[PDB]
């Protein structure tokens, strides 16, 4: 309910479009069904993205690390062009949809056109593309951000530039970087059911041993014994 309310674009309430968009844009949105089908398809692919996130993140933790801070970039776009959120905007929803589409085309991690390269491109940028489509959806774009056309174009350009700056440079000794980044905290790890932790546990994990100090099975239950103390 909340997802559909906050993300599904509404093209059936004229009052909201008058409040959020200039009257020519409201007439354009309400008149032709092509743009309406495009926004419906936007919301549908966002629903499939939601299911993909649900299977990827079963624990429901929304915090995740990603290259470009979309919210801060939107804020910078707001305060560079002096966006007045109290007034209707002049940005087409369809322009937002096509802009995010062509931007996602421009963000390349693996290049090529055969099915293998295209599938790897989709998988490499799947999560960031989901985040981009959710953040720059025409609903939130027209409701809470209220960016103009030039501001939106500047935002797309900045996202492209920062993403290309975020790609790993070849020749980087990522192995030594990982070794040092995982070795530095070991100088800080200490040791306080009772389970072995700290540098002994890290030692055993890297010094693979047939004898754990505190071997264990965090075994779960599925039936009524999961909740029934007597059965468990």
């Amino acid at each position: 309910k909340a997802f559909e309310k906050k993300f599904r674009f509404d093209y059936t309430n004229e009052r909201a479009l008058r409040r959020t968009l200039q009257e020519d844009l409201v007439k354009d949105v309400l008149s032709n069904a092509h743009i309406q089908n495009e926004l419906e398809r936007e919301f549908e692919r966002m629903r499939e993205d939601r299911e993909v996130l649900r299977v990827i993140f079963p624990t429901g933790d929304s915090k995740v690390v990603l290259p470009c801070n979309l919210l801060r970039m939107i804020w910078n776009a707001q305060k560079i062009f002096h966006i007045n959120p109290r007034l209707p905007s002049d940005l087409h929803p369809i322009k937002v949809v096509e802009g995010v589409k062509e931007l996602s085309k421009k963000l390349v991690i693996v290049n090529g056109d055969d099915p293998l390269s295209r599938q790897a491109q989709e998988n490499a940028t799947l999560l960031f593309n989901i985040h981009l489509r959710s953040t720059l959806c025409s609903r939130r774009m027209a409701e809470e951000f209220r960016l103009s056309g030039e501001a939106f174009d500047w935002l797309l350009g900045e996202i492209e530039s920062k993403f290309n700056q975020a790609i790993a440079h070849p020749g980087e000794m990522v192995g030594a970087l990982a070794a040092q980044s995982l070795g530095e905290p070991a100088t800080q790890m200490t040791l306080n059911k009772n389970v072995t932790l700290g540098v002994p546990r890290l030692k055993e994990l890297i010094n693979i041993s047939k004898k754990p100090k505190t071997p264990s099975l965090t075994v779960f239950l599925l039936g009524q014994s999961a909740r029934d103390a007597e059965r468990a």
């Binding site: 309430n13 009052r15 909201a16 409040r19 109290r86 409701e143």
Partner: peptide
């Protein structure tokens, strides 16, 4: 900041 009691329908 300029907040208000506006809804999406009315000012």
């Amino acid at each position: 900041r300029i907040e208000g009691d506006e809804t999406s329908t009315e000012a």
